[PDB]
Symmetry: D2
Subunit: 314 residues, 4 copies
């Protein structure tokens, strides 16, 4: 009768923010933190512990090492190099594949047999790498993917239509990055067709474009202003973690392995997927219009081309 145990690997801006989300939300009762930078781990574990007395239910936070993964239920990896102003996520594949080779190896050696959730960029390729490196079933390796892009798209739409974000059903799919695409054929508020409504406005075409551009380029805009992003992804990671430990069968856009869905194979990419205690139950295959079909195929190809050139993946 064990409790729920999360091991976080990588305790920088993103990891520590995710840790604080877990302390606020009490999704799990035990969190173990691993990082090369043991002193920052020490400092954050103490600071975090001091918040736990106000957590809705008990959360135990501790500094850990790889042996601690043996009975972990979820391993969350936020370790690695981040982009500078003027850099793309794909600009990181080389260094971060190096790092994941090491990390996932250390984890599997502890006899870990849970679920992986990865945030390190480029997240689709790193999720793919975690799947390949680990040998685990696809259901048990998840990338955060467009969990965050979808939230940004919803946030910008909630402002444009002046309603709660919870009342906007809208999705970004594809690469978590420059080839991502909005699913305008779906995006709605209680059935209001948002793109059609925007098009009716003056320079509506312009507004439709700005909403997508601000979605696609949000990471760049935040990095320009404060150097790094972390709250959005931390919250997105928390949301996925919740769907797993509360066994929800909730549909979320995450980075998932495709094996024939959307006519693509052998690539992790952002799609709606059913999430439960077992990880990804299945990819959800939605109708795409012609523009969406064309953009999704191009995104998959973009990712697959970069993967074919990554020597670490061979």
């Amino acid at each position: 009768f064990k409790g729920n145990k999360v091991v976080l690997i990588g305790n920088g801006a993103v990891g520590s923010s995710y840790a604080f989300s877990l302390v606020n939300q009490s999704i799990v009762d035990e969190l173990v933190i691993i990082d090369l930078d043991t002193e920052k781990v020490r400092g954050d574990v103490m600071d975090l512990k001091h918040a736990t007395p106000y957590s809705p239910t008990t959360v135990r936070v501790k500094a850990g090492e790889y042996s601690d993964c043996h009975d972990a239920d979820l391993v969350v990896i936020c370790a690695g190099a981040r982009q500078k102003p003027g850099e793309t996520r794909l600009d990181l594949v080389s260094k971060n594949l190096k790092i994941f080779k090491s990390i996932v190896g250390e984890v599997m050696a502890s006899k870990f047999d849970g679920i992986f959730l990865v945030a390190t960029n480029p997240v689709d390729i790193l999720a793919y790498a975690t799947w390949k490196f680990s040998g685990l079933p696809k259901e048990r390796v998840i990338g955060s993917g467009t969990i965050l892009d979808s939230a940004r798209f919803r946030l910008l739409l909630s402002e444009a239509f002046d309603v709660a974000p919870r009342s906007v059903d809208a999705q970004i799919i594809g690469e978590h990055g420059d080839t991502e695409l909005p699913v305008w054929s779906h995006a709605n508020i209680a059935g209001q067709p948002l793109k059609t409504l925007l098009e009716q406005r003056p320079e509506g075409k312009a507004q439709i474009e700005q909403i997508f551009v601000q979605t696609r380029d949000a990471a760049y805009d935040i990095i320009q202003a404060k150097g790094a992003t972390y709250y959005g992804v931390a919250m997105g990671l928390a949301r996925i973690t919740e769907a797993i430990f509360r066994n929800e069968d909730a549909v979320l856009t995450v980075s998932a392995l495709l094996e024939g869905e959307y006519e693509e194979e052998d690539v992790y990419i952002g799609v709606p997927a059913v999430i439960n205690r077992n990880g990804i139950r299945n990819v959800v295959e939605i109708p795409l219009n012609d523009e969406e079909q064309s953009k999704f195929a191009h995104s998959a190809k973009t990712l697959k081309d970069i993967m074919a050139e990554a020597e670490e993946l061979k």
Copy 2:
């Protein structure tokens, strides 16, 4: 029919962590953020907004200016200088009093008439300054005080006795800082007398001392390790914010103005107090044993002596 509006002033490590706590907890539906550093604000407001679609209920985050305080319900101040390794919180007094004279003046000029909640150090003196600069009733000016020290004490006890932190009722009172004191006459788990039980262990006196030393010196230990603290205080600030907006009448240890309670006057200091939508309803006066009476009076005197020498005050 207005919603609940918080203005954060000071969006650094502490302020932004508090803002993220509010995005996670959905205590209020509107958060406005002010800092001299407008670029950091723009960046944080964006990053935070992107978390809000997953908030339990709607939270709107925006960059603001003082004029936005006119109809604010709570102003939370986390602006100012922090301490370096080696420094105490009292070392910050002159610098942060000058800053508060400016901030509080700009807030009051907006016609603000809500509640203030202060974290800037030294927090007891700065809560007092906020009360005096603002002219507001004492019920409406709160310092975070020992909200955080009490949590640390509970956390260390919960490890020493191996139970949930929410099952430990234990309190730190006094200055948020070096003259703070544990209330061992009270500390208990379902009535287990924690000091008495600890004294029964091998080198129990030593354990009793180490638990308080690790509580008292936690800030220094964290700063040594990662340069500043922010999660504990953000969570404590969120707890107080919840007691207010959910009108709880919850008893929390915060920095409050004393006017006779504990035989002290004209000083903000950490004590249990009842918190509700109107702010501090009243200070709770608990019995202290002789050691605790001694230390509490010493803590009050220490703060009052510092206030007596402060040019701004």
Copy 3:
């Protein structure tokens, strides 16, 4: 600096279940309960209070009278006759209109100036009566309407497609009752077209019909089995109450007054509407396909024809 106060009028199966939902959810900090049956109220208020120490945040429950409505923020009406096996909700109109003339008059005489939320059946007509008897603006009078039908529709779809209910976006609009209609032009899971997918299955047309029939007739099925329904409606009432007190601007299907939207006027009927601290901010006008336009107009006419014949109205 007032807290949030709800007065429940009608403490039967529905009212007491709603009260228990509020004790579980801590949406508001104060709940006052009125019923002619003062013994049941005394008994429920006690039982409920005993649950409150485990509520997420403070909830105070008490027995009240109309005078207690003076500073209430929300009055929720669940008082009146329910239907028997075999009866429709429209059968209740004359009896429950007489009751509302009395209740609403007693509330308004207390100087109440908040929001009304109505569950008594037939709920659309009784929300309309509440608006007219009270003289309050339409934003401040809400019927629960299809909040519950939409939930049932989502629940049955979530079983048909094997995903979380919160992952199904689907709506019932129109009368809360026999002329209600599914919005199949919208119903989707992450964009999966649910009617189209169902039509692809063996006897898909049949499944499509059975899903709506089980939605439309759910109340009758539950009443046949246990004599009355209460959990679904209590939960829906709590959802609406949350959207108000957390100022959400959330879109929910409730009974709202139409003044031109959907080409209908002078009728309360179930439609998506934006809900916040001020009540219904506005009705949301969504595109309906030809079948849905037909059925919605028929539902509106059905309600308006009944209102036209009602002596009290």
Copy 4:
């Protein structure tokens, strides 16, 4: 990677109220309901399901049968006869021991191997019976016990001292019934000694007595007014369920087997106990003053005497 599954046996006022709490609180993702009265089960399951779309996270509700207990994590028993005005809880032992013999037998036959939580009265004796009938470790059989009495005591004190119930730490221990006792040596608000404070008031001794009398006799007062109690116990049951599935190590007053604690053995009785995913981790042994020692011993003896006369327990 299974989710969390609760089977409720007995779907009357108490059981159905507990079920509605679980739908509001989303403690677990799956609830199965068993009752002889299959029609009321059918009606409640439907009514409850229709609430689940607004649950914080997914809750699946269904009508079940004993075979469904095979992989249940928690079985909650609220089945059986309830008291009439003018009756005590011990007035039920005979009929309800009969019923538990049957129920627990049917459950164990399904190969259930989780935790039992019992509410049926008299709850201490019925928890003891569930332990004996089932053969399960004491850690895995819990009675609701004074979870409710403690809440009532706290509620009455919160009114007398005008603070949040969450800020009153106070406990009732002993039999869930007439021999229960307040722990005045402990009861406090942030260290304020409540009994001492009450004694300082005019007729303070009277008020101290009324507070206890209204605690002890609450069930009778509610039964006189509306015929049965159910919300308080449902909420108390929910609280215990939460401590289990969120693995809290929270101290709650519940009915637990004593094996030497408080100098008593072979009796289930209301005491503070540490609750986690494994059930009762341990009884918490607090100092009692002389009056409390005397009353607790008498309560244990009262229960043990009645057990020795219950032929069903032999």
